[PDB]
Amino acid sequence: SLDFDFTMAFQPIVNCRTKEIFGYEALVRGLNNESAYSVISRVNEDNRYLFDQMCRVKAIALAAKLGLTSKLSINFLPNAIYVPERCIRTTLEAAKRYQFPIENIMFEFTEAERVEDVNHIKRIVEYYKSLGFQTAIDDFGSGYSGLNLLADFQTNIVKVDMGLIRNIHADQVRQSIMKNCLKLFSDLNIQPLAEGVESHAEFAWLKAAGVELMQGYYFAKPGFESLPSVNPEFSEA
Q: Please give the residue ranges that form the binding site for ligand C2I (CB under 6 A).
A: 11, 26-28, 35-37, 40, 55, 75, 77, 138-139, 162, 196-198, 216-217, 222
Written as one letter, the residue type at 11 is Q
State which residue, 118 or 209, has the beta carbon closest to a copy of itself: 118
The pair phi, psi for residue 176, each rounded to 5°, is: -70, -40
Smallest gap from Cβ 171 to ligand C2I, in A, equals 16
- Calpha distance 87→17 (Å, rounded): 37
Q: Which stretch binds a copy of itself (CB under 8 A): 50-58, 80-88, 128-136, 143-151?
A: 143-151
Within its chain, how far is the Cα of 179 from the centroid?
Answer: 22
What is the number of other CB atoms lying within 10 angstroms of the CB of residue 221?
A: 12
Binding-site partner at residue 11 among a copy of itself, ligand C2I, Ca ion, none, CB < 5 to 8 Å by type: ligand C2I
Of 147, 200, 221, 235, which lies in the binding site for a copy of itself, with binding defined by CB under 8 A?
A: 147
Compute the radius of gyration of the chain from its Cα atoms. 17
State which residue, 10 or 185, has the beta carbon closest to ligand C2I: 10
Q: Is the separation of the CB atoms in 165 and 202 below 8 Å?
A: yes
Strands 7-15 and 20-29: antiparallel
State which residue, 138 or 202, has the beta carbon closest to Ca ion: 138
Q: Where are the alpha helices (DSSP H) in 131-227?
A: 147-152, 162-165, 172-187, 200-208
Give the count of residues interacting with Ca ion (CB under 5 A): 4
Residue ranges in 157-176 that form contacts with a copy of itself under rule CB under 8 A: 161, 163-164, 171, 173-174, 176
- Calpha distance 203→168 (Å, rounded): 9
Instruction: Summarize as ranges the residues that interact with a copy of itself (CB under 8 A).
Output: 111-116, 118, 140-152, 154, 161, 163-164, 171, 173-174, 176-177, 179-181, 183-184, 187-188
